[model samples]
Target: SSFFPDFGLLLYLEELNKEELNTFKLFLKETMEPEHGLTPWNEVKKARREDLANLMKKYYPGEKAWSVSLKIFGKMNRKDLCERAKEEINWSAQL
Candidate 1:
């Protein structure tokens, strides 16, 4: 796992639009610990895709992150993103 499959979740996060990214951040802040878990939500308040990706990698890792991402997407009612994330892993596996 040199590269690690968490990139798939990164790619998924990268696909989020402005409003979606806002919601993502909100969900993360509400769900993850304020000063624990991966990192402080205040720290993550201004996080972009790459930062969020690394946080997820630190907390979840690999397909574990994928599952969490899918759950988030589900909470957001963005089934399309879930499918896209699954495809991201499927596609990245070839590399």
Candidate 2:
């Protein structure tokens, strides 16, 4: 869950232009505040797979999970999302 949000949003931001990136950062700050902001990679890695699986079930269902994930990642301008998708075959494999 945290990794998806963090990586997805970060990847989305990475795809943006400077102005868009700044806006995204601001939006992220406003939306996430101190509680849900991007954690360190080690911490992200420490996240439970069950939690991530649950998150995927909630946010991305059925055979469209990869597409939905990619769409969300693209819409948010998050490069990390795409990267994570690429890195984790399970994310797209089922879909």
Candidate 3:
């Protein structure tokens, strides 16, 4: 079975702005390739965490999602977002 994203994690992504997504797309090589089956993210449409999850899965689904998310935030020059996401995604561990 495919491992879908945690609901909280998806919520956090949905909270991000579209410009942030376009910047994140800048770091994605697959967003530029047809074989990758990934589309460059933009602000024109509402961001869907499921689509985000699917895009990343197309690239490297075996990796931990939090790690990949950090990479995206880091590349987008938003460490604040990464840290926020890290805390959010790990909230379950504290409970």
Candidate 4:
């Protein structure tokens, strides 16, 4: 499925009952939690590669993190992106 196809399913899942909702939540937690086995970046990279393989997999997979990254952020360097992400996390924490 394309990336947009999943958005509708995500919205529908969001409206499910508590039991179903909890199940989905647990699935997401299991899939995403770094301590489970893979790190957060690894999980994200995996999903990105699977979902956008044509656009992301070749350049982004296996060791070279920057290639897949630049695909998302235009021409920005990794350090600048990291700083921006850190600030965004900090700002979100304040909320």
User: Which one wins on lDDT?
Assistant: 1
Model 1 Cα lDDT, one tens digit per residue, 1-95: 43334356677787789999899878776667645565467567877888877776676667676676678888998889867656656876877
Which 10-residue window of candidate 4 scores lowest in summed lDDT?
Answer: 1-10
Q: Candidate 2 overall Cα lDDT vs. reference? A: 0.47
Clashing pairs in 1: none
The number of residue pairs in model 3 that clash at the backbone is 0
Per-residue CA lDDT of model 3 for 1-95, tens digit only, reads: 12224443355566568776666555554333565444433421344656765555545544455456667667767777777766754774566
Give the count of colliding residue pairs in each prediction: 0, 8, 0, 0
Per-residue alpha-carbon lDDT of candidate 2 for residues 39-84, written as tens digits (9 for 90 to 100): 4223323334334333444434543433544654555767766666
Highest TM-score against the true fold, candidate: 1
- Candidate 3 residue pairs that clash: none
Off by over 4 Å in 4: 1-7, 35-95
> Candidate 3 — worst ten consecutive residues by lDDT sum?
1-10
lDDT of 4 by residue, 6-67 (tens): 23223333344555444433444453355544444343344422343332233334323333
For each candidate, what TM-score against the reference? 0.71, 0.30, 0.54, 0.28
Using lDDT as the yardstick, the better of models 1 and 2 is 1
**Candidate 2 TM-score, true structure as reference:** 0.30
All candidates in order of TM-score, best leading: 1, 3, 2, 4
Candidate 2 lDDT at 87 equals 68
